[PDB]
Structure formats: C-alpha cells, structure tokens
Amino acid sequence: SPRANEIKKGMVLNYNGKLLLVKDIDIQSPTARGAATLYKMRFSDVRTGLKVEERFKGDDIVDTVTLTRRYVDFSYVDGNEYVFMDKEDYTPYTFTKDQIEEELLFMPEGGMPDMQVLTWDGQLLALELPQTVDLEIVETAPGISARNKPATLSTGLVIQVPEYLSPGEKIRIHIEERRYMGR
C-alpha cells in the first residue's frame, strides 16, 4: 500500500483507469498558515502519450505497478511505428510516435547503448534512455565569454551551446536536464 510521499520519477501508477508514468514531482510547501505540503505530479499516460497532472496529500494511498526492464536495440521505423528488439530473446516491442515522442528528441536514427523498455506482465509501457547522448549539430550560427547560442541537433531538438561550436560537430547532452556537457 504505497503512499504519495514515497512516489518517485520513473514509477508507474494505476490511477483512475490509467497507467501513468511519473515524469516529475514538485513538493509544494504550504500555500497558507495551517495548510499541508502537497505533491504535484506530472505524468505521461503510457497508452496515449498524453500528459496528466495530479496533486496529492502526503499520506494519500496510491497503487504502483511492478516494473520489469529489458535492454533493447532500435530495429526500424515504419511511419508512425517504432520497432525495438530485446537484445536477449529477440522479442519485438512496437511503440507509436505518441508514446515515445519525448525520447525521440534524443534518440539518433541508429539508436544508442543502454536503452531499456518498461513492461508490466507482458504489457509494453515506456522507453527508458540512458543519462547522456552524443548528437550532431545540424544548424547553428558560424562558430566564432560564458555565453551560449541556440543549436538544432539531428533529431530536431534545439539546445544552448557555447559560441565557438560549428555545424557538423558532435556534442554530449544530458538528456534529463537538456544541457550541453561538451564535445
């Protein structure tokens, strides 16, 4: 019987007929004298990819599902469908663009190491990426301080990078924080 104050980013809740992946938790301090601390959670509906927000009291009872992770390789894209394959038993995992939209801003067209899938008793839930990714800059102002400029990466993602960077350079990105880490 888990409570809301014990929930962390990465868990999946069974809440009001939906399976919700926890994306963010904001511990909000009391709004007024006598009020309680509240837990504002941001979720992603694993079936539709739609965002859901809910606020809970610390002791509210929730239901977390048991998760199973499996290492995967990106197999191929077919329009809206994205096929991955289990590196061990070669089981295919098909996601729609909606379900992995935010992960697609970081995943290069050849996939990447340390990629996992979240499952619950045979049901495919989400794609879990590693901490960092190396992506090539396609569009940026000519490389010429402590000041950053915008850069469009191969996946379409726009990020802030140092002035001297030029198009075609491969850069390291912290996925969770969307920050440049170096070449």
Author numbering: 1 to 144, 150 to 188
Paper text:
Additionally, numerous bacteria possess an EF-P paralog called EfpL (also known as YeiP) of unknown function. Here, we functionally and structurally characterize EfpL from Escherichia coli and demonstrate its role in the translational stress response.
In the frame of this study, we solve the structure of E. coli EfpL (EfpL) and uncover its role in translation of XP(P)X-containing proteins: Through ribosome profiling, we explore the EfpL arrest motif spectrum and uncover additional sequences beyond the typical polyproline motifs that both EF-P and EfpL can resolve. However, a separate alignment of KOW and OB di-domains between E. coli EfpL and for example, the EF-P structure resolved within the E. coli ribosome from Huter et al., reveals low r.m.s.d. values. This suggests the relative domain arrangement is merely a consequence of the unique crystal packing. The structural alignment ultimately revealed a β3Ωβ4 loop elongation by two amino acids for EfpL, different from the canonical seven amino acids in EF-P. In this way, EfpL_R33 remains apical similar to canonical EF-Ps. As shown by the lowest-energy model, the local geometry in principle would allow the unmodified arginine of the EfpL β3Ωβ4 loop to reestablish the interaction with the tRNA trinucleotide. Furthermore, the model suggests EfpL could mediate specific interactions with the RNA as—unlike EF-P_K34—EfpL_R33 was found to stack between the two C-bases and make polar interactions with the phosphate-sugar backbone. Hence, based on the docking model we suggest that the prolonged β3Ωβ4 loop and its central tip R33 are capable of compensating for the lack of a modified lysine. A literature search revealed that E. coli EfpL is acylated at four different lysines (K23, K40, K51, and K57) in the KOW domain.
